[PDB]
């Protein structure tokens, strides 16, 4: 003797196929679906993906790397040529220091 | 546990133990001639007591047979390599594609296979063509207030196909 509602039995399986089996993924307008194919398969894969791959394939020396290679080569050549030990410790001057004495 | 009834019988249980014990002797007993010897020895053991009119004697000997069988079964019996448990067990389930599909194809691919698709369309027209009156009248006529069984009777009353048949007929061929 009671229902508590009024609404209709909804929805149905509105298949995106059974109308346009040539069509691509999204909704029922069969021109702008081809336009979406064009925009996401030219602007996601053609102009962005391989261009970004060639951009990251070579960009300048990120974090100064090849500069560091050649500078280390020249500095180790220096410290071979002058006979002093390469990479002396105490990077700061051992004289320029003030220890808090007792 | 079976679709026909609940109790098997005493005879059905004795018989299932007979088939299982004989299969285990097959698995124990290669070169097949000593198998024939021991199998007819087993047949002799069950014809020791054909004249059993008692019942509690029969079921107590059956329980002792289960004891003496579990005392001497074999761990890897020769199970047939297509049965469940065996070596196949839907081995070639790589291509058991269900047959509600082959209806969502592209229409050029449907232009590739014309006559088979015309025949499938007229089978499907036969399927929806004879659902309402026959199956509804049988499934409201023949059931009692409980259905109480699982094997179902055919459309023996007047005309066309027996009910509840689509996913029993149109199964894959088990060699795809």
């Amino acid at each position: 003797p009671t229902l508590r509602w009024q609404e209709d039995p909804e929805p149905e399986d509105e298949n995106l196929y059974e109308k346009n089996p040539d069509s691509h993924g999204y909704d029922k307008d069969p021109a702008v679906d081809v336009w979406n194919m064009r925009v996401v398969f030219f602007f996601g894969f053609s102009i962005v993906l391989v261009l970004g791959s060639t951009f990251v394939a070579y960009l300048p020396d990120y974090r100064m790397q090849e500069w560091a290679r050649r500078e280390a080569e020249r500095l180790v050549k220096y410290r071979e040529a002058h006979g002093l030990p390469l990479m002396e410790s105490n990077c700061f001057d051992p004289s320029k220091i003030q220890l808090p004495e007792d | 546990f079976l679709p026909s009834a609940a109790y098997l019988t005493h005879q059905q249980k004795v018989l299932q133990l007979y088939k299982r014990a004989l299969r285990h002797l097959e698995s124990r007993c290669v070169h097949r001639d000593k198998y024939r010897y021991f199998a007819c020895l087993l047949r002799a053991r069950f014809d020791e007591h054909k004249n059993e009119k008692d019942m509690v004697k029969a079921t107590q000997l059956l329980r002792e047979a289960e004891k003496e069988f579990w005392h001497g079964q074999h761990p890897q019996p020769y199970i047939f390599p297509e049965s469940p448990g065996g070596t196949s067990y839907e081995r070639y389930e790589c291509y058991k594609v269900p047959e509600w599909c082959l209806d969502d194809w592209h229409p050029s691919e449907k232009a590739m296979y014309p006559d088979y698709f015309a025949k499938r369309e007229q089978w499907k027209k036969l399927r929806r063509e004879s659902w309402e009156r026959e199956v509804k009248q049988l499934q409201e006529e023949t059931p009692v207030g409980g259905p109480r069984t699982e094997a179902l009777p055919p459309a023996r009353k007047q005309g066309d196909l027996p009910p509840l048949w689509w996913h029993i007929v149109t199964r894959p061929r088990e060699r795809p």
């Binding site: 030219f42 894969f45 060639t54 960009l59 | 594609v97 599909c101 194809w105 592209h106 691919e109 061929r173």
Partner: protein
């Protein structure tokens, strides 16, 4: 009378997507690879020369590859 119709799910949508994907990686794959091949067959990278006596160059022309 022996042969049987095998039942496949579909081929059209899958082969269509992979066809579009290979053609649209190939669409600007050929110009980029052929163009960079023209770059390293014509224009050259650079040489390893040194800063001369009293000269200050750009913040570019410190790099090997010309497109870099």
């Amino acid at each position: 009378g022996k042969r049987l119709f095998i039942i496949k799910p579909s081929g059209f949508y899958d082969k269509r997507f992979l066809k579009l994907l290979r053609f649209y990686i190939l669409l600007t794959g050929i110009p980029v690879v052929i163009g960079i091949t023209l770059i390293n067959v014509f224009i050259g990278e650079a040489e390893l020369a040194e800063i001369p006596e009293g000269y200050v160059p750009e913040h570019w022309e410190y790099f090997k590859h010309p497109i870099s």
